[PDB]
């Protein structure tokens, strides 16, 4: 009962809006591949929007000032935080349910991760309009572990490919165990199809 959402190709506020609402409804959401999140408008605007965020620091002691979190996991965490009553207990109990990650760590790498189509760039942006990768945005404004995340993200894609190739292998066997075995599953199959499960 955990929404392991994919962060890749989603919009920063659109996803944060839906994450912030589910989490207030007692849902435990995991947003993953947060570097894959992209923000609408061209790159230079969104960087300038974040550079202006860096300048807003407490004059007399910046150690007290707004903690400008650089990692895409903590840029996404902050935009969810702004859409919660985080000064109250239910908005602090909210953020405890949300668990945000860059790349995709071990619990979730071997888990089918969901997609929000309402919070998705292909669905919600016109294809002509420019967008800004949170992976590139975070990197150029002080995030350190882009290239480290990118290799571990690549070391699991080639690992998770070998899973999928071995799943296609079982699925070839399953269909070839239906051509062969059709004479003795027929009376069972021909009541699935009367109820519209296979046609």
């Amino acid at each position: 009962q955990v929404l392991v959402l994919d962060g890749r190709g989603h919009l920063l506020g659109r996803l944060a809006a839906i994450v912030a609402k589910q989490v207030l409804l007692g849902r435990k959401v995991v947003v993953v591949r947060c570097e894959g999140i992209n923000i609408s408008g061209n790159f230079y605007r969104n960087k300038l929007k974040y550079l202006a965020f860096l300048r807003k620091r407490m004059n007399t002691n910046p150690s007290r000032g707004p903690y400008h979190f650089r990692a895409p996991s903590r840029i996404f965490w902050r935009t969810v935080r702004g859409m919660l009553p985080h000064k109250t207990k239910r908005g602090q109990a909210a953020l405890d349910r949300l668990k945000v990650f860059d790349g995709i760590p071990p619990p979730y790498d071997k888990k089918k991760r969901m997609v929000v189509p309402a919070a998705l760039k292909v669905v919600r942006l016109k294809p002509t309009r420019k967008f800004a990768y949170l992976g590139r945005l975070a990197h150029e404004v002080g995030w350190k572990y882009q290239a480290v995340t990118a290799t571990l993200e690549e070391k699991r894609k080639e690992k998770a490919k070998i899973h999928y190739r071995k799943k296609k292998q079982i699925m070839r066997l399953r269909k070839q165990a239906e051509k062969n075995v059709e004479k003795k599953i027929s009376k069972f199959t021909e009541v699935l199809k009367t109820h519209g499960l296979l046609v």
Partner: protein, 176 residues
């Protein structure tokens, strides 16, 4: 008038009421595009007072009836002559539309004069709505649809119904 919903075309005829000097004054017919008959009978006086010495008090409405579509299935080309107030000065405009219905092609003018020019309905005065044969249509946004074998695909089919699952497990297809 609030140009609200789809407009209806009204035949509103009205006469300056019987006098001693003029017992039977000439009857005046108008094409009034209104959400309903009440504001058709309001906008009747607005245009008649602008043209004739005839306020609602020194006059009467003799027939306010809706004129329907005599070909509501034939897609037709409509040439609408405007008279709209800008923020500085008023402008004569000939504008073309392409609807089944005269009164909806006039609605399609009210949404567009808002869209382009930020002209709210009270600024606008529809003076003439004429069905035009497809050579007498200068504006090329209508002339592109004058094509026997018209053939376009639906290129980028952006899906709606984005919230019915809300948490699908597949990136949505947009090529159909």
């Amino acid at each position: 008038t609030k140009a609200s919903g789809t407009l209806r075309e009204y035949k509103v005829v009205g006469r300056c009421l019987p006098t001693s000097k003029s017992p039977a004054p000439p009857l005046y017919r108008m094409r009034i595009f209104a959400p309903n008959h009440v504001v058709a009978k309001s906008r009747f006086w607005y245009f008649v007072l602008e043209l004739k010495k005839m306020k609602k008090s020194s006059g009467e409405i003799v027939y306010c009836g809706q004129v329907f579509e005599k070909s509501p299935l034939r897609v037709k080309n409509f040439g609408i002559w405007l008279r709209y107030d800008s923020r500085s000065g008023t402008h004569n405009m000939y504008h073309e539309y392409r609807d089944l219905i005269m009164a909806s092609a006039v609605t399609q003018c009210y949404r567009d004069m808002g869209a382009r020019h930020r002209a709210r309905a009270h600024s606008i005065q529809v003076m003439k709505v004429e069905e035009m044969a497809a050579a007498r249509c200068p504006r090329p946004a209508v002339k592109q649809f004058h094509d026997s074998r018209i053939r376009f695909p639906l290129p980028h089919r952006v899906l709606r119904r984005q919230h019915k699952p809300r948490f699908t497990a597949k990136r949505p297809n947009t090529f159909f």
